[PDB]
Structure formats: C-alpha cells, structure tokens
Write a protein that binds this ligand. Structure first.
Ligand SMILES: CC(=O)N[C@@H]1[C@@H](O)[C@H](O[C@@H]2O[C@H](CO)[C@H](O)[C@H](O[C@]3(C(=O)O)C[C@H](O)[C@@H](NC(C)=O)[C@H]([C@H](O)[C@H](O)CO)O3)[C@H]2O)[C@@H](CO)O[C@H]1O
Ligand SMILES: *[C@@H]1O[C@H](CO)[C@@H](O[C@@H]2O[C@H](CO)[C@@H](O)[C@H](O)[C@H]2NC(C)=O)[C@H](O)[C@H]1NC(C)=O
Ligand code: SIA
Ligand code: SIA
Ligand code: NAG
Ligand code: NAG
Ligand code: NAG
Ligand code: NAG
Lengths: 318, 171, 168, 319, 171, 318
C-alpha cells in the first residue's frame, strides 16, 4: 500500500551543453543563436532612400546616374554593389572618409555658389564620357572651365564661395589632368598652370599632371576630386589658371541617419532594427550567426552554428 | 545536484503530461496518477524569468566601419579586422558560457523542485510512512482515494492514522 | 533552491535582530527567541567575501575632447568603445544576477544546515512538524533549550522518556 | 512543548535582479555603480601643470598664450577647452599625433638651434597677429626670415641642427604662404621659392603657395607648421631661399605623464586616479555611469543607472 | 553548500587514498575501511568534464597589427594600445571569474555527492539504524562483515534484520 | 555496532580562489594560465620563409640582402630584427601599409616590365652602396636611369606597362633626389626634372629635390620609393625627364600567408599554431601570461601570474 513521486520524461529529449557535460539530455530546449534572417531590407517606419545604381559620391557632384539623388531627406540610406560615382576617369582623394560622412548623414541640401566667370571663359564645357539623356554632358554640380578661344591662355581667375548658413557646408572641386601636352595648351594655354584653394581651415595648391602619347597609356585625361568642409561664416577661395573643375553648388549634410550597404530588395511592409549585406535580422535571440558585418541595433555575431538552452529538466527515460 | 532526478528516482514518466512533477499511487482500489500544480509552476516560473532575461533588448546602435563594396585603407582595415574578431571571440565565449552555465542551473533547479516536494510529502506523513529509497513511500495504514488526494491536496492529517500506523510498523 | 527560506518556513521573523538565523522555543517556563551566532557568521562572511572581490590598468586618451579628430579613425574609435561598453554592461548584469542568485540560495543553505544539525541532535525525542518546528516529546526547560542551541544536548538522557510519549 | 526555526526579515526591503527573477525582494543590498563622482579635477599628489588658455601645440612654437609653459616637468598635463595654439593664421600637419606626444610627456626641455643668418637677411620679422606687451611679436621658438632689403632675392641659405644629445629631439618649422604675389615678391624676391629639409631619417621639400586678391578671402597669409623627430647623433638641414619660418629652439619631451582634457576646476586637497571632462571619479565600486570617455585607472563605464548586489537573504515578511 | 564536507563531517580521511568517498565500519569482527566506487566516479566524471570544456577552445587566426621592429604612427598606435589593453582587461576579468565560478561549483558539487552517498545509505538502512550528528550510522542489529559488504553493495535487505533492530532500538 | 561515511583528504593541500573565499583550500588543482613557452618558431607543417636580414620591402626592390627572397611561395613569412630594406639611403611611402601587404601573402611572382630606353640613356647606373660581389651594383628590380652622355639633358622618355595577368600587380619606382646641383646636372642635365606616373587608379607627379642632407652610407642624395597596385587589364605609364629610378620587374603578391615577426630560431620538426616574438606557444590551457602581442590561433593574454582551478573537494585534514 503505496504512494510514489516522480517526474515527467519525453520519448526523445534534446541534447544540450552544461558546465560539467556535453550531450546532457533534456525534456525540451530552444535555440539562442539566430541562424535564419529575412533576405530583404525592411523599411517600415523609415523614410529611406535607395540610391540604386547611384553611389554616394555621385550625389555630391551630380553624376548622371545620380540625377534624382542630389537632394533628399532620410532615416536610412541604402547603397548597392556596382554603383557609379563618376562618368569621367578619375577618383576622389580621401574618398572613404567622405562616403562615411554621406552615409552617417540624415539628408542633403544644395546651395548655389554663385560662381561667375569672365568672358574669356567657356564655362559650359561638356564631354561624351558623360551622356545625360542622350547628349554630351557633364557633372551637374561642377563646371568644366576652359579658354573661350582655343589655345589662348586661360585668365587669372578668382572665385569665392561664402558660407552664410549656421551649419558647415561640404564643398567639392575637380582638378583636370590633361592627356597630352598639346591638349593642355588648347584648353588652357602654354602658361604654367596653378590652382590654389584656401579657407581659414584649409590651404592647398594643385597642378594638373599632364599625360603623354597614346590615349590608351596609363597617363590620360582624368579628373580628380577634392573636398573640404566650409565652417559657418567662413569664405573659401579659388585661384585658378585653368584646370579647375569649379563647383556651381555646394552640399550641406543634414541630421543623422543609418547607412546600409546591401544587395537585398526593399520591403516596406516589414519592420526592423538590424541589417546586413544580404538582408535583415528580426530575432528575439541575443546572438546571430548570419554575419559579423551588421549595422543598426544588433544581436551579437558569434562563431557558433548552434547554442541550445535547456528549457526543461534532465530527460531520464526508462 | 540534489538527490532526486537521475538519482534515486530511476526514471521519468513519459506517461505524465499533466505537469512536470507528479504522484503515482497504489492502493486496494487500484493505481492512479495525478500531477502537482504548485511545484511544476515553481519550475516553469523560474524558466520564464530566464528566457525573460535572454531576450533583454536594450541595444546601442552601430554604424558600418567597413565598406562591403569598396576597398578600405590597408592598415586601418587590419586594426578593424583584429578588433572585430577579438570582440567576436569574446561574445562567442560569453555565449557558450551563458548557455552552459544557465543550462546547469536549470537542470539543478528542476532537481531542487522535485526533492522539495519529496521532503514536503515526507514530513506530512510523519510516523505514518517510511521511505523505500526509490521515491515511493510505504504507508502503514489503508488509504482510499480521498486519502491519496488528501496527501496531494496537502491536507493529510497524520494523527488521524497514527495509532493504526504506529502499530503496523511494529507488528 | 533549498527547502527553507520562502519554502517550508512560511515567513521570516522581523523580531530577530541578533542573528539572521535562530531559535524560538515553547515550554513550561514560557517562550523566547535566541539568534544563532555560528550560522549567522557563516553567511555574513560569505557575503563579505563577494564584496572583497568586488572592490579589487592605467588608460590614456584616444578621443580628443575639444578638437575635431579625423573622421575615418573617429568612427572606429566610437565603434570599439560602444562595442566594449556593450561587453562591460552585459558582463556587469550577469555578475550581479549570478551573484544575487548564489547569495539568496546560499542563505537558504545555511538555514537548512541549521535545521538539519538540530534534527540529528534531537535524535528521537522530537519529530518534525514540517513548518520548521520540532515537537519535543519530553519535558524541556530553559536549560534544555540552550542545551539545544549550545549543541551540548545529550539525547540518551531523555530517550526512554521521550519514546514512551511518542507511543501512548 | 516544541522548538522552532526561522530567519530574520525586514519591513522596508530592497529589490534586486537574479537569474530567474527580475523583481526579487531581499533584506539588504548595495550599489555596484558609482553614479556621482566629483565635478572638480583632484590633483593632490600630482605635480601638475594647468595650461589655462594655452594649447599644448603652442608650447612647442611659443605662442604668447604659452609664455609660461615653454618648459617644465609634470606628471599630469591639463588642457582647457578653447586653448590657443596659433596667433598667426595657420595649421599643423599631423597635429593630432603631435598633440598626443606632448600630452603623454612628463615635461619639456628647450634646447637652442644656434641658427644664424647672413647680413642680407632679416631674422626679426614680426606681425600684428602675435602680440606681446600688446604690440608686434612672433613665435618665441621660431624666426621669420625676410629679405632685409625689400624686393631683393632672398639669398640661398642653408642651416643644420645637430642632435648632440642622448634622447631624441622635436623640431618644428614653419612655411609661409603669402597673401599675394605682390607680397611674396617683397618678402623674398621674384625668384622661385624652395625649402628642403633633410635628416638621416626624413626628407621633404616645401613650396610656398601664394594666394590672391583681397585680404578678405581665404587665400590670405598663412603659416602651415611641420615637425619631425631628430634622432640622437642625427643632424637636420634646411635648404631654403624664402618662406621658411626657421626654428630658433627645439624641444625634448621628458619622461611620461598623464594628459587630461577637462574644464573642471582644479582641487588640490583630494587625490584621485580617474578623470573625465566633468571632473575626477572616486569609487571602490567596479563600474560607473558618469562618462564613457575617461583616462587613468577607472571603473568600467556601463549603460545602467543601477545594478544592485544583494547583501542579504531572500525577504519574506509576516502577513 | 550542502550540509556535509566542511560541515557535519569533522574532517577528511588522509588514510583513504582508495577513492574520494568511503565507508568505515566497526563491528564485532574488528574494523574495516573501503571506498565507494559509484560516488567518487560521479564526481570525477564531472571534474573531468569541466576540464574538457576549458580546453575546447578552437579559435580565430589573428594577424599582426603592431610592428615589433618599427614604429607605427602615434595616433593609430594609441588606438591599438587602447583596444589591446581593453581586451586584456575584459579577458582578465573573464578568466578571474571563470575560475572563481568554476571553483565554487566544484567544491559544492563534491560536497553534494557526499550527501547523496549519505542519504543513499540512510534510506537503505531504513528503520534498522539511526544517525548521530557526525557522518555515522549506529546500526542496531548485529552486523556481519558480509552484511557490511552488503551495505556498500546496495544490496542490504533491511527487512531481514528488521525485527532484531526494531527491538534493540526500543529495549 | 556502527558504520561511517567520509571523504578523503591530503596532508598538504592546494589553495584556490572562489566567489566567496579568496583563501579556500582544496586537495588538487591545475593551472589555467600558461607561463612557459618554446623559444623556437615551430614550423613543421608550414611552408615558410625565414627572411634573415631581409626586410619584406627589400623583396620588391631587390636589395642585395634580399636576393634569395625575390620570388617564392610560403604560408608563413618570418621577418627578423636586423632586417635591411634599403641599401642606398631613402624611404618608402606608406611603408607600413606596403609592408603588411607582403606579410599577409602566400608568396610573390616577379614579372618583367620589358621597359627599353634610348641610346641617350645608360640604364645601368650602380653605386658603392649596393654591393653584390665586392662590386658596385644597384637594386635588382629597379634601374637607375642617367644620361649616357654626362651633362646632356636626359631625354623625354615614356614607358608603359600593361598588366595582362588576371590578378593585381604591385609596381614600385623610386624618385632620385640628387645631393647637389653639380650632380643633378651630371646625370640629368640643366633641364627641369619632372616625373609623371599614370594609371587608372593613380596619378601623381614627382620632382627631384636638390639639397644637402646628412651623409648616410657615405651619401647625401636619397631615393624615395613609391608604389601602387596595377589592376588586371590596366596599363601604367611613366613620363620622365630624369630622376626616375624605373622598375625592371613588378611584383605579384600571391595567395595568403601569415606574417610572424620574431627573434627566435626556426624548428622545422616542432609543430605550432600560435607565435609571439619569443617563439611559440603549444598549450591546451585557455589563457597565457607570456605576451600581449601574438599571431595566429592563440589563448588570450591575461594579466595574472597564476590562475588555479580546483580539481578536487575542499580539504579538511585530521
Ligand atoms: C665626405 C666625403 O669624403 N665623402 C663624400 C663622397 O662620398 C661624395 O662622393 C661620392 O663618393 C661616393 C662613395 O665613394 C661615390 O664614389 C660617388 O660616386 C658614385 C657612387 O659610387 O655612388 C659613382 C657612381 O658611378 C655614381 N652612380 C650614378 C649612376 O650616378 C654615383 C652617383 O653619382 C651618386 O650616388 C649620385 O649623386 O656616385 C661620389 O660622388 C662627395 C660628393 O657627393 O662628397 C664627399 O664629401
Ligand atoms: C590598356 O591598353 C590596351 C591596349 O594596349 C587597351 O585594350 C585595348 O582596347 C583597344 C580598344 O578597345 C584595342 O584597340 C586594343 O587592341 C586593346 N589592346 C589589346 C592588346 O587588346 C585597354 O583599353 C587599355 N586599358 C586601360 C588604359 O584601361
Ligand atoms: C571641354 C572639352 O574641351 N572637352 C573636350 C574633351 C576634352 O578635351 C578631353 O576629354 C580632355 O583632354 O574631348 C572631347 O573629345 C570629348 O570628351 O568629347 C571633346 C570635348 O569637347
Ligand atoms: C615680417 C613681415 O614681413 N611682416 C609684415 C607682415 C607681412 O608682410 C604679412 O603678414 C604677410 O603677407 O605684415 C604686417 O602688416 C603685419 O603682419 O603686421 C607688417 C609686418 O612687418
Ligand atoms: C567673408 O567675407 C565677408 C566680406 O567679404 C566678411 O564679412 C567675412 O568676415 C569673411 N569671412 C572670413 C572668414 O574671412
Ligand atoms: C546593509 O548594508 C548596507 C551597506 O552594506 C548598510 O549601510 C546597512 O547598514 C546594512 N543594513 C542592514 C544590516 O540592513
Ligand atoms: C591530481 O590531479 C592529477 C592530474 O589532474 C591526477 O593524476 C590525480 O589523480 C589527482 N589527484 C587526486 C587523487 O585527486
Ligand atoms: C653630424 O654633424 C657633424 C658635424 O659636422 C658631422 O661630424 C657628422 O658627420 C654629422 N652626422 C651625419 C649623420 O652626417
């Protein structure tokens, strides 16, 4: 005549790790590391700009791919794999620090610089290397200044952008590196070329580096870009001999937002706080094993395929 | 570790789904089985406070420090890669320690809840029952069902059976 | 979790102040409430040991508080410091929680240890009522009470008298 | 008659977090996060130099702000929010690295260069931007070389500084960028300007960059500064003909010291091993929530106002 | 903390190099000492588990970010000194805690296995014996050396000697 | 009659630290912080290079110390303290970025640039600074171009290198800076010296600088070194008046390897996965006290002399 105590068990328990033991069986566990993510960018509750074939640098200089992106407002800014920054050969000096100022930002304004050029100047220079809407063109925010009369010396010019706003303004400019010495002489003249650039907080001199012989060889016509912030109340001046690709507008980055670099397609139906190269991550869990490169509010990447946490007791079957 | 589960209790009862811990009884009427509410709830409560912590959401926002699509300056990207892997090694360690440590505690807390019921039942029965060492009590009077229920409902009055039980332990 | 605190003891005694653990008794001469010293030091010492651990590197500056710093490096400094702070915060919370868990459950421990030293002590002259009391089955005065708290109590002195009571 | 057991309890309990309970009442508990700290810098025990409105760079070139900090010995150097480094409009290449080398030091010796110049040169140039006694001056550690004879081609000169010491030596120099061509022609002549600098470990040349037109626009006079470390036993030579702001002294940074950036006021009656913008931090406690950015032997910053450590048992009061 | 090892047992036995937990009996046939294989091996198998867990640390390949034979620019150098040091600090705290926390479990684990052995015999001795405060069982029926072999053996049939003991406890 | 339960103890025990007790005495314990290491670079299992007194930068320019190490493969490259890179005095731009790139590779291939010069140029200049066999020599992958006829203007020359491989090539050149105008004249002429280098991913101009500097290795003239990666299908070109120390070969950094910087000798019979500058670390423990700076799969450095893990129960002696 008898009364017994006992506990439950399950047909098949789950194996989990303890301090004293791997392979310790349990009545039930659950996963603590997230191994599956949504493969689309989730943008509910966010005003976002999906730059598409545009690259953030193009935004500041107005490359044709970037025409619809010269201004904007955004919580988030998405950037895609093969994106286009330039239509004319050349790079941006110090370009990574810049992409990040554009990707940390929350919007862009454009302010005219009011730059005006003498008669001796063609300020309406264009190139086939920049086909906008079917025709020879150029960067939207710069102007390719050359001698109005071919061959005759480009005049000693001065231009001054004044920042009168209460925020710093990012100004950009190009320096044209001719392809052959014959060419330099056509656009600008035989005179020695020199571009000084100076604000209170910057100072520099650039000289076009002329190329030689075939178009095909490493040294050909390219345009390299430079940049500086202009602080509120501060004037910035250019002194050119020609070679200057001068800005018609300057930029002003507004607020703060989240830059995503992703190849995933945008889903506005879905909400999320954490993103990566190949999608999002919406999880309860504190650890994820999808990728070590994420941005936003994120579960920490760990190099473990699986970490089971017992939710039940030891599983002793009969 | 407390004596009960994977201890002197040979095994679990795959049959019981009523709760996590329970009673089985044998008496002249036959065999019954019920499950303890209070102690399965104690255990499931302590599991939820764990899972409730595990999903602590408070997170700092992190921005990209490496460019997925463009090249990055070669020395700084080595200082980054070294830093990122270090941090990961740390979290990977923490993670595994967490579930390892937290798993331990859980198994053990489950053991605790079973033992506590045992040493709870043990005390009610007072001199009326003795222990068989395998998780049963041998009871030294006759106990119909409303008496089994009585032990589970925790209302069993021992002096009610004590005389009978006292001289059946001896006789 | 051991059975004692928040367990089979329905509550604590706001009245006991000379100890964290202790005895109340009931007899002829009335009632009374002694704290147990041995078992109260056992706990207070384990607590002051987690604290000696608690109170136990010289770091320079990498972020410039009053002037701009180069952007790319600045955003690496913030990420690391944010990352590190995430680590130290998560660590700080686990420590505190793991420590409080151990503390509470170790206290519970020092109580069940007391109870169990007393039970083996009153070998057969009492038995458990299950709510923390022993019912002593013989005559027991204030000398016999400290006798139980001193751990100086000799059971065989009372065994014959106690057993006859547990049986009739 | 019976005997009973029981634990103490309290009325006003305090609540802590555990592994299973985020709301657990306990008899006693202590804070593990120091939340207060001290809104003064506590420089007891420390031979400290406060820079006031002087910026650490200016110690090296000798701006009027730093005329009382051109030398010294310290174990804690202090830098204030809008400290002046330059009086003459300009900037320093790699200023962020040089600022930190100073702020790490335990002091500065100055050693002369003994540079001298021929008669056709004037080495006492001054300017309205750097003032001592409220009239025209220049950097105390640098000399502005111009053609004595205005207009005249600044003579091709050359100047070596030899490090006959045992430790390495810090040398700063300046390049002048004139406001206009008109002006450059006066200060240094019509010739092409070129400044070469060479040690056994460093090479570089600089060309002054002449800006244009009104004084008002950005392209106006500047003095960009430059610096290298001269090794012990190593000489360093300036080959120039106009534009150079030549050093008349070099630095030696002595020892190691703790650099603090605060605007908190100095308190010399209390000591401390931790600091932030706000002031000192003094706490047994392992973590703090005052400032993420600190310096010295500090408690680790954590993202919480409060974590409580139970210093008592579970609390079950009477109903 | 379980009641036993720094507790109601006075001291360990140096004389027992046989295993970690053991029996000592005193009957008419002299005295003996033997160690329980079952109980030590529970503990030993757990201690060796914590050792496996510590050494199972597959890791990342880390490359060099600090030039041992050349200077690196001051600003990055200071970032690398700050991070490296901050990781060490984390990793030193993580070790000092790993151990404290792995040691507190290790004593208390071994302490439990003692009590489990104590209970295991207690329950098996049933009514035929009683406990003094120390880790002893005063056995109230005459004990053969063979019967003692049988108490460790977990094969002691209490009902055999029950009437003999039950009388001696009373007369 | 009686039966008793007990635990074992030992005569002289150990002490460990626990959560509540700094001074708690257990029976047994093992270390968790490894204190001794091996004073050898354990390379069994590794295809390695001991560079000796060669400095990885040397490999690319082919300094005389480095001739045994101009091409090859490794999965591990060991750089040593007495390392020579330059044998003529001078510097390299982004020398640490550059260095690290090599130290991460699994080898190098050399590729001929094929540059050919006029009759007007002696491409064979050498110096007392680079010695091969008691005889004046120069870097193996560069060629010091000076005028064949002393004092004559070094001819305007244009060299082009096409990368027709499938991976990126590293190419290096030097800009010579004479010690005097007597000298700058004897090699190059009285003409203005200019060196334009052009790629799709680089454009820059260099101008030899005349000045007296300390003499090093006997000499007051310097050689500045420069480099850029040439992309597949990309051409790079040099326009030079004089002063270019042109490349005769370019490098291709192949694969991935593991840069060990260390003072310890090699053991090709000992096997290891973790290195410090003192040697190797073969341990199973999670932590070590040996060095903060380590390379490879390593236990993490901690600041403690000792850490003891109890491996037995609390010790209570008789
Ligand atoms: C203080 C003193 O006595 N020493 C220097 C003396 O070194 C220096 O002369 C130079 O001496 C070196 C070392 O012997 C060489 O001999 C220089 O001529 C060489 C050379 O060996 O390097 C000859 C060589 O064929 C030349 N190679 C080429 C391709 O040009 C080089 C080359 O001209 C120079 O390296 C480039 O400037 O020089 C010899 O000039 C003199 C003058 O510098 O000053 C003394 O005081
Ligand atoms: C590099 O040069 C090669 C030729 O030297 C260029 O590739 C050539 O493309 C043109 C037009 O497409 C052809 O006429 C040539 O025959 C091609 N060369 C060969 C050998 O196939 C190439 O475009 C240049 N690459 C650059 C400068 O980016
Ligand atoms: C503004 C200007 O002069 N652009 C001319 C350019 C540039 O001269 C070369 O791109 C640079 O050398 O060349 C063109 O053939 C072109 O790009 O279509 C014609 C064009 O009008
Ligand atoms: C040494 C020297 O030349 N200083 C002269 C400077 C420079 O001409 C310009 O500052 C640089 O363009 O100008 C002054 O008006 C000035 O600053 O007070 C007069 C002064 O004597
Ligand atoms: C900009 O120019 C205006 C007038 O030209 C002047 O008021 C202002 O002070 C200038 N700003 C600077 C920074 O020189
Ligand atoms: C509890 O601890 C705190 C700090 O340790 C202390 O101030 C207080 O006096 C103690 N109070 C009690 C015993 O409740
Ligand atoms: C002490 O540890 C060593 C190695 O872990 C082991 O060989 C030995 O058995 C241990 N001693 C005892 C009996 O605990
Ligand atoms: C340093 O200058 C002294 C004085 O002329 C000279 O003896 C020595 O050769 C110079 N050192 C170097 C490295 O040229």
């Amino acid at each position: 005549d008898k009364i017994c105590l006992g506990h439950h068990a399950v047909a098949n328990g789950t194996i989990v790790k303890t301090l004293t033991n791997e392979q310790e069986e349990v009545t039930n566990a659950t996963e603590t590391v997230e191994s599956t993510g949504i493969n689309r960018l989730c943008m509910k509750g966010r005003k976002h700009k999906d730059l598409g074939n545009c690259h953030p640098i193009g935004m500041l200089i107005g490359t044709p791919a970037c025409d619809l992106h010269l201004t904007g407002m955004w919580d988030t800014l998405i950037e895609r794999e093969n994106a286009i920054a330039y239509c004319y050969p050349g790079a941006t000096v110090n370009v990574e620090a810049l992409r990040q100022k554009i990707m940390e930002s929350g919007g862009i304004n454009k302010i005219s610089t009011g730059f005006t050029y003498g008669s001796s100047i063609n300020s309406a220079g264009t190139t086939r290397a920049c086909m906008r809407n079917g025709g020879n063109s150029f960067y939207a925010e710069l102007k390719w200044l050359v001698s109005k009369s071919a061959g005759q010396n480009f005049p000693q010019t001065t231009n001054t952008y004044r920042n009168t706003d209460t925020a710093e303004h990012l100004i950009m400019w190009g320096i044209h590196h001719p392809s052959s010495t014959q060419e330099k002489n056509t656009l600008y003249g035989t005179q020695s070329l020199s571009i000084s650039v100076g604000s209170s907080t910057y100072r520099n001199n650039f000289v076009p580096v002329v190329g030689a012989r075939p178009q095909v060889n490493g040294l050909s016509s390219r345009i390299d870009f430079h940049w500086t912030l202009v602080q509120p109340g501060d004037n910035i001046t250019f002194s050119h001999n020609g070679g200057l690709i001068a800005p018609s507008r300057v930029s002003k980055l507004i607020g703060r937002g989240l830059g995503i670099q992703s190849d995933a397609p945008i889903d506005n139906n879905c909400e999320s706080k954490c993103f990566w190269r190949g999608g999002s991550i919406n999880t309860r869990l504190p650890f994820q094993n999808l990728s070590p490169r994420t941005v936003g509010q994120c579960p920490k990447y760990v190099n473990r395929r699986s970490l089971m946490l017992a939710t039940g007791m030891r599983n002793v079957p009969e | 570790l407390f004596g009960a589960i994977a201890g002197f209790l040979e095994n679990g009862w795959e049959g019981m789904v009523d709760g996590w811990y329970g009673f089985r009884h044998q008496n002249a009427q036959g065999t019954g089985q019920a499950a303890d509410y209070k102690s399965t709830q104690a255990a499931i409560d302590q599991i939820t406070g764990k899972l409730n912590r595990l999903v602590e959401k408070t997170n700092t926002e992190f921005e990209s420090i490496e460019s997925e699509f463009s090249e990055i300056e070669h020395q700084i990207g080595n200082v980054i890669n070294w830093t990122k892997d270090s941090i990961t090694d740390i979290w990977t360690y923490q993670a595994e320690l967490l579930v390892a440590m937290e798993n331990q505690h859980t198994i053990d807390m489950a053991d605790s809840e079973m033992l506590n019921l045992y040493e709870r039942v043990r005390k009610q029965l007072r001199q009326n029952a003795e222990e068989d060492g395998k998780g049963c009590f041998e009871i030294y009077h006759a106990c119909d069902d409303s008496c089994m229920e009585s032990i589970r409902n925790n209302t069993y009055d021992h002096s009610q059976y004590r005389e009978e039980a006292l001289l059946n332990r001896l006789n």
